[PDB]
């Protein structure tokens, strides 16, 4: 990424953390 905010990282990573449900 370029420069995302604090919660901007979190709202994408939640998806990567899942990859089952919460895909």
From TrEMBL:
Family to which the UniProt record says this protein belongs: Belongs to the tyrosinase family. Hemocyanin subfamily.
Organism annotation: Penaeus vannamei (Whiteleg shrimp)
Membrane-spanning intervals of the chain: none
Superkingdom of origin organism: Eukaryota
Protein name, per record: Hemocyanin subunit L2
